[PDB]
Structures are given as structure tokens and as C-alpha cells.
RNA sequence: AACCCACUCCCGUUGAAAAGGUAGGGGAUGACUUGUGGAUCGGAGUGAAAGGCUAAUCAAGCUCGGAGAUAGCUGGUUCUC
RNA sequence: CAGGUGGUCGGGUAGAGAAUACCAAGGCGCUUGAGAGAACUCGGGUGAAGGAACUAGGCAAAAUGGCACCGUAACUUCGG
RNA sequence: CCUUGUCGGGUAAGUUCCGACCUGCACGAAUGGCGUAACGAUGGCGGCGCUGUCUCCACCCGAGACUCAGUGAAAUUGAA
RNA sequence: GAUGUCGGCUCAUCACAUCCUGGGGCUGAAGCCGGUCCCAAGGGUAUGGCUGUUCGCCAUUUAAAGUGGUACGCGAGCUGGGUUUAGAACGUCGUGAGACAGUUCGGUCCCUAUCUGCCGUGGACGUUUGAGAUUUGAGAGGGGCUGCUCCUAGUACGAGAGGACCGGAGUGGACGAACCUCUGGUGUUCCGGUUGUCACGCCAGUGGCAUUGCCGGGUAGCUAUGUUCGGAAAAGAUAACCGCUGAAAGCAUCUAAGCGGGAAACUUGCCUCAAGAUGAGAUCUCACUGGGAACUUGAUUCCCCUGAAGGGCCGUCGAAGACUACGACGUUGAUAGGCUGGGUGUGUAAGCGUUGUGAGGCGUUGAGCUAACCAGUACUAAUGGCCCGUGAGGCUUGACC
């Protein structure tokens, strides 16, 4: 179906109040001091102080 | 009062006469008393009850101190039973000794949850046809309300969603056997919830 | 194991070793008229479960020109005796194909003696 | 037998050869009828000369069915083919002899005749 | 409803799902390291491990049974000769899964599957 | 079966498609099907005849002029005291 | 752009066959993917006991379907 | 039209179907009248088999739907 | 400048002028049965043949197969059987085009839900220092149905026929909830049979594709056709009704005062949610006890040091689940995967050796394989990491050394 009246700025912006981002699962490698996602192989290829690739 | 145990699957036992008695085996750890809520300090009267085997790393310091007033070293969960008149000390042990043969009981517990159920499954609605010209609608709900002057949909309308794990109680199930050695209760009938769950056993008031 | 352990107490030896395709005879208790008696039910076994206490077999009999198949519980005290009169090779677990064959076509072969 | 418009033969000598259920007696709307339950049948195919004519409304009791009868146990007697026994205006049988087996779950105070007359 | 049902469809039919793990194992037993998707790696450990366990007993019947499900001469040769003897005293756990970021084109959680000793 | 046609259910209806698709269906040596070229045109042609077809438009097309047709009928008609 | 577009070559194994099921030569992975595996829709597989009681109507679905032999009724324009 | 006219058959029950009655409002002989084998993607009934059509739906398999990343319309809309 | 018209299916909600069940008055009500009229809406209130039909007539039940409203409920939930646009035909009217609320065949039913409404499930903040856990119940939902047999008793009543009131015991139908112990279904992830064809250098053995190629079975899970349970008992106030004392009106009088009995209705009693019940309730326990400056003084603001109780992130997952949310576990370790012993399902695996010319049979022979089931085991994967959440909890009055 279609609408009978357009939604105003307040009504539109209220809907997208629950639309945010969060990925703060970072961790610092003990050896290389490289930032990486937790429980993930680091971009260089180290996981808990061990080269794997 | 009542007893908290675990559902552990159903079984069957045969008497000497020959009839088959479907049985639900309920494991009961010995239950410790955590509190005795007197009337003067709390209004109503009730007793807390707890099962065991929770690791020390999973209990908060507040709960550890709560289980320190009575030397319980308590475990998972805390349950409370309302009772008429019976004294209980801070540290006590509630076992299956209060039950006997017969002794119809009420068995509660979280039922097995269906993810998101339709109206045919949740409310036992009847479906439309399947061949006689029917359009895509084969299992969907039909009408909701009247045309012009309800002006809306009446609250409490039966619609689809979440045949859930909400608490439900089967009424007046008779106990077949009580084991004071293995700490088991044999209940004649079904028990809500899956095996390995949590179940509450209380004397039946409906009689 | 608690449910696997309760069943062991109800298990008491009542049956011999048998398999599908045998022609067993079963003695079943009859409680009628305030007098207990046995009754002979002879047929051909067509199914078997081996769950433990939840074990059951199905035996097919042709009585008065009418077929009849009776499912029996293995460890019930109603099933008193179980004797094997014939055993033959069928190389299959469930002989449900015999529900259609009646006479000479429904003969159990004999490779096993 | 177990539903309206359910063809079944009869277990009787003076009856027809095939009858059809038309009403399951009992409560408001009984969907099913087991062994030992009264039904209302219509004669669909009669023997060349018996006692019940073709196309007659009679009352019958179900004695066999492929669904089987369930006792207070995990054991069920399951036949292969349905059957019924006709009844008069009163609930006694019409014929004399009964063909095929019957079940001992049926015998009540009111059905001591057909159970005695049938070879089980 | 999925209550205690094991195995994930991955939006593939049964034959594609079988043939995909059959071709993932045969590739894993050539390179000993694969950059694959995490859900595909969580199911690959239920296919390669039975083959590695089967490889610990050399026999004509065992080699034929292995070939029947990982059909490749090179993989059967790699088994029974290098694998199954290296892991002759390791009870289970023949490979590990290490999550590795996300995919570039899509966002698919990738994971490295690596044999435990290499 | 190719080929032609389109009897039935479902899907699709903002579709992959301004008339289709998966299943089933009728003719399939003939009053057949089809490639190339040509003839019949607007109160005029063709029509195993439906008022069907005549470039997605048909109880008489498309385009340009009479023409800004005519409308006793709708709608609209803008600064102040 | 699941549509329309005239004509030639057109292999192997089974099969009467240019049908149908697999392959050779040759060409393709159909220009968004990865997850989980609720309702509901679409295209399908199986079904305890009944067997059209559903419905405006056996609509849809289910079942038969091949080669050899035997045998085949009312009627008939004497072909069927 | 009165009309589900009256009788019979089929079914337990038949405004539908088939065979008769003649009181044919308003049949009728080349706008053809009665019959007719074979032919019908034709209309209306009845029978065998068959079955999820239906009692009453239950499970399972793929494409949707739901979550993540990219691209990204629609009709409607006096203001909320 | 459009409110889609009759029937059918799905889904219901409301009135009582009530069809059954419930409590009563009168009766030309002996009993069993009935007729009529008050109170009562708590729950129920049928399957078919015909017809497009609602309606109606039929055969068979049931305790009963209620009357109406709700656009003669319900097409942005489904059909298009009826009326019904275009084609065709019968009868009648009209010379004719054509017409008939006279008949018969055929005939496209669109929308991805923005805002009210409803079924579910989450995020933010508040409840006055902050957390973990349990909870009273303001209030709202769920349920309420009923037949048939036996004892009282063949007693009362009735010439006889015929036959209870009240009370007690048993097991049935419809409905609802829960669960796989059983009986089945499914179980394209387990084991076998086999047709066509391709392939592994060939024999054997095996694997693709042919709807899972076609099937025979089947673990867990799910499921009903299976297993169990429920409708109450009891208390209070009452409707109709039955009254006791009692005058007004020396009698009488159920009422004016007063005192009772009183039915599925009402309120408790049985089950679930329920302090966003901004009136935000209540018990147990745990955590924080350092300074400096400006400006104003519940004193406010800022700088440093501190970050506890716990929560979140993340990971292994769940009989929890659309996303969430909820439950368990992260080496203080059995949360998931694997491995070893079991159980189940399937059915004598492959290969060795003999009989036969050969298919085939035989020690090989309960062997082999065996998803989701149980027990054990750190072999693998869950990192002695990061972010939130602070530093003693404002002011008045009374008791209180
Ligand atoms: Mg669940
Ligand atoms: Mg459909
Ligand atoms: Mg509407
Ligand atoms: Mg209003
Ligand atoms: Mg035979
Ligand atoms: Mg396939
Ligand atoms: Mg062409
Ligand atoms: Mg064709
Ligand atoms: Mg045109
Ligand atoms: Mg103009
Ligand atoms: Mg002019
Ligand atoms: Mg060819
Ligand atoms: Mg079936
Ligand atoms: Mg069947
Ligand atoms: Mg019908
Ligand atoms: Mg009907
Ligand atoms: Mg059809
Ligand atoms: Mg003519
Ligand atoms: Mg308008
Ligand atoms: Mg009234
Ligand atoms: Mg009440
Ligand atoms: Mg209406
Ligand atoms: Mg529609
Ligand atoms: Mg016309
Ligand atoms: Mg070979
Ligand atoms: Mg291929
Ligand atoms: Mg509070
Ligand atoms: Mg801490």
C-alpha cells in the first residue's frame, strides 16, 4: 500500500535512531604491537605471538 | 513447599499385573535452604531453595556473601516457595523424603520453545483450500475484524508468533516411585520442557 | 545414565536369541473371568526394535483366512514365553513386503540351517 | 468403520458382503470410531440371497480395522482389512456365525454374544 | 525448527554440499593451508578428520573406502604415506581454525584451516 | 519429435516479458508450415465472419491543415483600504 | 531483456527414432555474494486410518502407459 | 412462468441426470423435423482404480523472506 | 475527479427477545414425560443429497443442532459458482437494428503496509550512591462443556403397564495444554538392492548424473493419528424463588426495622504475565573512606591520582533463537570439535582359499560400515586482554547519649 501523508524530518530521524555502528573488538599484539580484531589473525599474520601465514 | 529438580527423559515401568506406566524421571539434587522469609520483615512467608554445582568464577561477590550467611556454598539459580506454616532454619536440607506413593503433584517448568509459529500451529486454525482456484494464501490467517464499526482490531486477537518457552504447569500428576538413594522422582505423565532442563515439583492443591 | 540405569533393574531374562523371518510362538497372559491363563500366538516375525526396555517385535499371523499382525513389547510381563520354531535367511531387517503376498509367494526361503 | 463413507465388509453369515459407514454415533461430531464402537451403515453390495436387502440403513459395530486396537501396554493388535457386525433395532446381532477373528478388548456386558460366537 | 539437528545447508543442495567438501579436503591434503570462509571451515573439520583417522590403518579395504569419498589418486597417496603416520600418537584434533579478518568484496568471515603440525 | 497453434492449474501483475514461464495439452502429407519479392488503404481495403486485422492505436487508422472548431458543462482567475 | 528470427554439418553407448539418459570434438559456471535455517509464499519428496466425505464441478494432484501372445461386447454407413 | 408439474430408476438422502405422462403460457418440418456409427482440448450425470482434494494436516529438500557488505526504485504525499 | 454488489472458505467479536446445560412459580403436573412463565450470556450449539444459492425438503444423529447486530461482519484474507462487458444459441416481442430483471455454454479478481489497530520481541531513560539474586500482588488474561452405565431400588408411586427425586462409583465424546516412554509418519546428513550411461591404465571394487534415478529400512529431532493431565471440591454476597418474627390496619401480613436458605451468573478458590502499579513497592548480600585551584555557597565548575562490586566487547555454543533477547562455558577449564570404548541403524564388507565350464555357493560367517544418542579423555579451538561503571552517597521535621 501507499501513505496518505509524508513523514516529516522528526518522524524520519526517529526511525534511524537505532542505526549505529560498533566494532570495538580490537586488541594489541604482545610481540609485534600490531592492532587486530580479537580472536583473529593479525593483518601481518601473527596470532598470539606466532607467525601462521 | 516444593522441590526443584531436572527433567531427564521419559521411561516406562511394568507392574506385576501387566499394565504399562509411562514415567518421566526427575533428578533431584539435595536442595539447601538459603532464606526463611518471616512475616514480620517481609509480609508474606516463603523459603528460598537452590541447586548446586556452580563454579566460583561465575558467582558474583554479592551472591557469594548472600550464600555466606547460611553455610550453603550454593550453585545455579535460586527458587522460592510460598508456604502456609512450617519452620525452617537458615541452613537446612530439603530432599525427596516428603513425597510418597500416589500424592498427585503439580509440575511446572519452561516448555520447549518453538521459534516463531504460525496461526495453524499456535492456535489450531483451519487452513483454506489447496487446489480449488485458491491464490497464494493457503495457510495465512483470514479476516481480522468487521468492516466499518469496530474501527480497529480488538485486543487479544489470535495471531501468529512465538510459540514460546513460557512457564506452563501440568496439573495433578501422580508419583509412581520415590528413590531416596539415587534421588529420583517417577511421575506418571508428561513434564513441560526438554530433557536436562529445570522443573519444579509441588503438592497439588486442586486435588 | 540415570534413565539407562533404571531400565537395567526392570530387565530380566525372558527371551531367546531370534531375528526377523523366524516363525516364533508367543505365550500371552489372558486376564478374563477372574482366572489367568495363557494363549498361543504363532506367526512370522517381521520387525524388531532393540532400544532396551523399549524393545518390540511384530509377528504376522493368518487366522480364519484373515491376516493379523501383533506388535509385542519384549520386556512386558504379559509376554511370558517366546519359542522359535523355524529360522530362515532373508537378508533384510523389516519384512513388510509380506503384507501383500498371501500364500506360496510369501514363503521364507532357507539358506540358513 | 473409522470415518463417514468408509467401505468395509461384514463379519456375518446372513448379512451383506460390503457396507459403507454413513454416521459415527456418540457425541456431537465424532471424527473416528475404533473397534467396539457403534456406527450406522448402508448396504452397498449384498449376497445373492441373505436377510438384509441392498441399500438398507442398519446399525453395526466395528470389530476389526487396520488402525488396530491399543491395550494398556505397548502392544497393539493390527489387522489387514476392516470388518463390522450388523445389529437389529436392539443391539443384538442378526446372523448366527462370525467369520474371521475378533478381539478380547470388545467383550463387554452387552457383547457377550458375538465374542462367544466368533472363533478368535 | 532445528532442535538438536546438526549440519548446515550453506544455501547449497545436498550433492553440491557433498562435492564441495570432497573437493575442499582433496585441496587441503595438497597444500596443508587454505584461505576459506569460516562457516565452511566449521564443517570441513567434520570431513577431513574422519579421513585422517581412517588413514592411521593401512589396508586395501581402508584405502578403497578412503578413495570412495575423496576420489583422487594424489590425495590417497598423500594419505597412508605422510599423514596417518605423522599423527600416529595424536588423539584427535588434526587441524585448527584461525579466523582471519573479513572478505574484501563481500563481508564473509574468513578463516585459515591448518594441519596441527607442519 | 522438429514446426505450428494455444485447452487446463499455478506463478507473474511495480513482472525476465505492454500478453511470458514450469508442468500437462491439439494438428503434425496437408483446407499444412515457412524464407524472399510483389498486389489490395481510410466510409477504403481484407475477413472459413469476431466487427476481427490494417505497424503495440480500429463501430472505420497515422500525420499535416480548416483550427485557438464548438462546449447553455467542469476547473482556475494573482496588490491594499 | 526467461521472448521472436530463414537454411546446412550433426559422432559413441542403450533405444524404432532428429525422442529420452549419460559422454567425444567444442563451449560454458548463466556480472551481486557470505550467513542463519522463524512465520509465510513458490517449485518438489513421503505419509499412519479412511478414499471425493472437499468443491459450483475428481479443478489440481495420484494411477496406466513398452514389445510378444491370448481375447474382446451393444451398435454400425459393414470401414469401424 | 406457475415448477423442485405427476410417476419410475439410480443414492441412505438427487431443484442436477435418464425413461414416461400431455394441461405445448411460448416445438414443428430447408431461419429445416425426427434418428444416426465414427469423430469432439464441447455441455450434464453415474461406476472401477487412484490418490493430501478432504477429516487434519506432520516432516524433509531447494528458491524466496530474515541478518552482514555494495548498488539502490515505485505508486502516494496540504501540514502533523 | 469510483464506498468493489449475492453465495462459499478462514477468522471472530457483541445483545438476550435463551436451543442445551443451571436455579425457581403455576398446571386439567399419580410416576416417567410435558405445557406456560420469571432469573441466568459461564460454556457449547453437526456431518451429507439436491440446488450458485442464504432459505428450503430430505436420510442419519446429538444435550442442543438459537434468534439478530457487526457495509444483510470479513475480496489492499481466498474463490467467481450467481447477477455478470464484449462471442453463440432456444423461446417470445419488433418488418429491422435490437430487447427480455425468461432460459443454456464460455469468459483476466492488481498493490513491496507510511500512520491508527493487533500478535510477538528488542534499544534508550527513570525508580535519588551503585550492583547480584529472590519476590508481595494494584491490575489484566487463561479455563468454565457434556453424554452413557452400576449401587441406593425394581424401593416409592401406579389396578397394571410403567417407573424415580437427592446422593455415591465407573468411563466415554468435543475442546485445551504438555511430552516422545510406547504405536506410527517424516528423517535428500546412516546402511543396503538395482536399470541406463560416463569415469578411476584394465579385472574386481567404487564414484558422479538420470526428480534423493527408482526403491527397501531407519538414530536423534519434529510430529499426531499416540501418552498423561484439566473443567472441579469448598467459602462470601446475591437474581428469580422459599421463608421466621412483625406492625402500620387489635386479625392477617416474607417488610417498614430485623433475622435466614438461595444457581454454570458475581467475588475468591486452579494456571500464566504482572512495581513504566512515574503510587515506579519489599528482604539478603556485595563495592567505594585521595588531594589542589577559581567562583557564587543545596555550594557550582575545573586539574591530577584513582578506577572497586559488577557489566559489556570477543570466542566456544544451546532441546534459546528471524535480528535480537535468554541459559551454560572460556585453561581456577569437558563449552564445541576430534579420539577410545559402548548403544542404535543396516545386514554376513573388501581381500585370502575351495566347488562348479560358468552365473552362483561355501570356512570368509553377526563381519564391515554406522549422522544428531551415553561415558571417558585437554589432542584442537575458547588469550592471567580492552571499554564502561568510582572515590561514602543532597535538604527540612520528630524521636534518639
Ligand atoms: Mg527450543
Ligand atoms: Mg498455491
Ligand atoms: Mg476489506
Ligand atoms: Mg473511533
Ligand atoms: Mg505368497
Ligand atoms: Mg541428484
Ligand atoms: Mg520458426
Ligand atoms: Mg506437442
Ligand atoms: Mg493493432
Ligand atoms: Mg480548443
Ligand atoms: Mg473555422
Ligand atoms: Mg545420438
Ligand atoms: Mg494418507
Ligand atoms: Mg496406506
Ligand atoms: Mg459432495
Ligand atoms: Mg459440503
Ligand atoms: Mg486433471
Ligand atoms: Mg440444423
Ligand atoms: Mg477521490
Ligand atoms: Mg431474560
Ligand atoms: Mg465463577
Ligand atoms: Mg457483507
Ligand atoms: Mg486479491
Ligand atoms: Mg451478444
Ligand atoms: Mg567390472
Ligand atoms: Mg558428469
Ligand atoms: Mg524496587
Ligand atoms: Mg575487578
UniProtKB/Swiss-Prot annotation, chain B:
Keyword Repeat tagged: no
Gene Ontology annotations for the cellular component aspect, listed alphabetically: cytosolic large ribosomal subunit
Residue spans crossing the bilayer: none
PROSITE patterns: RIBOSOMAL_L3
Name of the protein this chain belongs to: Large ribosomal subunit protein uL3
NCBIfam families in UniProt: L3_bact (TIGR03625)
Post-translational modification: Methylated by PrmB.
Residues bearing PTM N5-methylglutamine: 148
Sequence similarity: Belongs to the universal ribosomal protein uL3 family.
Subunit structure: Part of the 50S ribosomal subunit. Forms a cluster with proteins L14 and L19.
GO biological process assignments: translation
Keyword Transcription tagged: no
UniProtKB/Swiss-Prot annotation, chain C:
Record PROSITE patterns: RIBOSOMAL_L19
Recorded GO CC terms: cytosolic large ribosomal subunit
Name of encoding gene: rplS
Name used for this protein in its record: Large ribosomal subunit protein bL19
Domain of life: Bacteria
Family statement: Belongs to the bacterial ribosomal protein bL19 family.
Keywords: Ribonucleoprotein, Ribosomal protein
Organism ancestry: Bacteria, Pseudomonadati, Pseudomonadota, Gammaproteobacteria, Pseudomonadales
Molecular function terms, GO-annotated: structural constituent of ribosome
Any GO BP: translation
NCBIfam families: rplS_bact
PANTHER family membership: LARGE RIBOSOMAL SUBUNIT PROTEIN BL19M (PTHR15680:SF9), RIBOSOMAL PROTEIN L19 (PTHR15680)
Function: This protein is located at the 30S-50S ribosomal subunit interface and may play a role in the structure and function of the aminoacyl-tRNA binding site.
UniProtKB/Swiss-Prot annotation, chain D:
UniProt xrefs under InterPro entries: Ribosomal_uL14, Ribosomal_uL14_bac-type, Ribosomal_uL14_CS, Ribosomal_uL14_sf
SMART domains with a match to the protein in the record: Ribosomal_L14
GO biological process: translation
Keyword annotations from UniProtKB, A to Z: Ribonucleoprotein, Ribosomal protein, RNA-binding, rRNA-binding
Protein biosynthesis in keyword set: no
Cited Pfam families: Ribosomal_L14 (PF00238)
GO molecular function: large ribosomal subunit rRNA binding; structural constituent of ribosome
GO cellular component: cytosolic large ribosomal subunit
Recorded family membership: Belongs to the universal ribosomal protein uL14 family.
Record's subunit section: Part of the 50S ribosomal subunit. Forms a cluster with proteins L3 and L19. In the 70S ribosome, L14 and L19 interact and together make contacts with the 16S rRNA in bridges B5 and B8.
Function noted in UniProt: Binds to 23S rRNA. Forms part of two intersubunit bridges in the 70S ribosome.
PANTHER family: 50S/60S RIBOSOMAL PROTEIN L14/L23, LARGE RIBOSOMAL SUBUNIT PROTEIN UL14M
Protein name (Swiss-Prot/TrEMBL): Large ribosomal subunit protein uL14
Organism of origin: Pseudomonas aeruginosa (strain ATCC 15692 / DSM 22644 / CIP 104116 / JCM 14847 / LMG 12228 / 1C / PRS 101 / PAO1)
Curated annotation (Swiss-Prot), chain E:
InterPro entries: Ribosomal_bL17, Ribosomal_bL17_CS, Ribosomal_bL17_sf
Keyword Ribonucleoprotein assigned: yes
Matching Pfam families: Ribosomal_L17
SUPFAM superfamilies given in the database record: Prokaryotic ribosomal protein L17 (SSF64263)
Gene Ontology molecular-function annotations: structural constituent of ribosome
Family: Belongs to the bacterial ribosomal protein bL17 family.
Subunit structure: Part of the 50S ribosomal subunit. Contacts protein L32.
Protein name in the entry: Large ribosomal subunit protein bL17
Species this chain originates from: Pseudomonas aeruginosa (strain ATCC 15692 / DSM 22644 / CIP 104116 / JCM 14847 / LMG 12228 / 1C / PRS 101 / PAO1)
Organism classification: Bacteria, Pseudomonadati, Pseudomonadota, Gammaproteobacteria, Pseudomonadales
Amino acid at each position: 500500500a501507499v501513505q496518505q501523508n509524508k513523514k516529516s524530518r522528526s518522524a524520519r530521524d526517529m526511525r534511524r535512531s537505532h542505526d549505529a555502528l560498533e566494532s570495538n573488538a580490537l586488541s594489541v599484539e604482545k610481540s609485534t604491537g600490531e592492532v587486530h580484531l580479537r580472536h583473529h589473525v593479525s593483518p601481518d599474520g601473527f596470532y598470539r605471538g606466532r607467525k601462521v601465514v | 513447599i516444593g522441590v526443584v529438580g531436572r527433567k531427564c527423559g521419559m521411561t516406562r515401568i511394568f507392574t506385576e499385573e501387566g499394565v504399562s506406566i509411562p514415567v518421566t524421571v526427575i533428578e533431584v539434587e539435595p536442595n539447601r535452604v538459603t532464606q526463611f522469609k518471616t512475616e514480620e520483615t517481609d509480609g508474606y512467608r516463603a523459603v528460598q531453595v537452590t541447586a548446586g554445582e556452580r563454579r566460583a568464577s561465575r558467582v558474583t561477590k554479592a551472591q557469594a556473601g548472600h550464600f555466606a550467611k547460611a553455610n550453603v556454598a550454593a550453585g545455579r539459580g535460586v527458587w522460592e516457595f510460598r508456604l502456609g506454616e512450617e519452620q525452617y532454619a537458615a541452613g537446612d536440607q530439603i530432599t525427596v523424603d516428603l513425597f510418597q506413593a500416589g500424592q498427585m503433584v503439580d509440575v511446572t517448568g519452561e516448555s520447549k520453545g518453538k521459534g516463531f509459529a504460525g496461526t495453524i500451529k499456535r492456535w489450531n486454525f483451519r487452513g483454506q483450500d489447496n487446489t480449488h482456484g485458491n491464490s497464494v494464501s493457503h495457510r495465512v490467517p483470514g479476516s481480522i475484524g468487521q468492516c466499518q464499526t469496530p474501527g480497529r482490531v480488538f485486543k487479544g486477537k489470535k495471531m501468529s508468533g512465538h510459540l514460546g518457552a513460557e512457564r506452563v504447569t501440568v496439573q495433578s500428576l501422580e508419583i509412581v516411585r520415590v528413590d531416596a538413594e539415587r534421588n529420583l522422582l517417577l511421575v506418571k505423565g508428561a513434564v513441560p520442557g526438554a530433557t536436562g532442563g529445570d522443573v519444579i515439583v509441588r503438592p497439588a492443591a486442586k486435588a | 545414565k540415570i534413565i539407562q540405569q533404571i531400565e537395567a533393574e526392570q530387565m530380566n531374562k525372558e527371551i531367546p536369541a531370534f531375528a526377523p523371518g523366524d516363525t516364533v510362538i508367543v505365550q500371552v497372559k489372558v486376564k478374563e473371568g477372574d482366572r489367568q491363563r495363557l494363549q498361543a500366538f504363532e506367526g512370522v516375525v517381521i520387525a524388531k526394535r532393540n532400544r532396551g526396555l523399549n524393545s518390540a517385535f511384530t509377528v504376522r499371523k493368518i487366522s480364519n483366512g484373515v491376516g493379523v499382525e501383533r506388535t509385542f513389547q519384549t520386556y512386558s510381563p504379559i509376554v511370558d514365553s517366546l519359542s522359535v520354531k523355524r529360522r530362515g535367511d532373508v537378508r533384510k531387517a523389516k519384512l513388510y513386503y509380506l503384507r501383500a503376498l498371501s500364500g506360496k509367494a510369501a514363503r521364507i526361503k532357507e539358506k540358513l540351517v | 468403520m473409522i470415518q463417514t463413507q468408509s467401505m468395509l465388509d461384514v463379519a456375518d453369515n446372513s448379512g451383506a458382503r460390503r457396507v459403507m459407514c454413513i454416521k459415527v454415533l456418540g457425541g456431537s461430531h465424532r471424527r473416528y470410531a475404533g473397534i467396539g464402537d457403534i456406527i450406522k451403515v448402508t448396504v452397498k453390495e449384498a449376497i445373492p440371497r441373505g436377510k438384509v436387502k441392498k441399500g438398507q440403513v442398519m446399525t453395526a459395530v466395528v470389530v476389526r480395522t487396520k488402525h488396530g486396537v491399543r491395550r494398556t501396554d505397548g502392544s497393539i493388535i493390527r489387522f489387514d482389512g476392516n470388518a463390522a457386525v450388523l445389529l437389529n433395532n436392539k443391539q443384538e446381532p442378526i446372523g448366527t456365525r462370525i467369520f474371521g477373528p475378533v478381539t478380547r478388548e470388545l467383550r463387554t456386558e452387552k457383547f457377550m454374544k458375538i465374542v462367544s460366537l466368533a472363533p478368535e | 525448527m532445528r532442535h538438536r539437528k546438526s549440519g548446515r545447508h550453506l544455501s547449497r543442495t545436498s550433492a553440491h554440499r557433498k562435492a564441495m567438501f570432497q573437493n575442499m579436503a582433496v585441496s587441503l591434503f595438497e597444500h596443508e593451508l587454505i584461505k576459506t570462509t569460516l562457516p565452511k571451515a566449521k564443517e570441513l573439520r567434520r570431513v577431513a578428520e574422519p579421513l585422517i583417522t581412517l588413514a592411521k590403518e593401512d589396508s586395501v579395504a581402508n584405502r578403497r573406502l578412503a578413495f570412495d569419498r575423496t576420489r583422487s589418486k594424489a590425495a590417497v597417496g598423500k594419505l597412508f604415506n605422510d599423514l596417518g603416520k605423522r599423527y600416529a600418537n595424536r588423539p584427535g584434533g588434526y587441524l585448527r581454525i584461525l579466523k582471519c579478518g573479513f572478505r574484501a568484496g563481500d563481508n564473509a568471515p574468513m578463516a585459515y584451516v591448518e594441519l596441527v603440525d607442519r
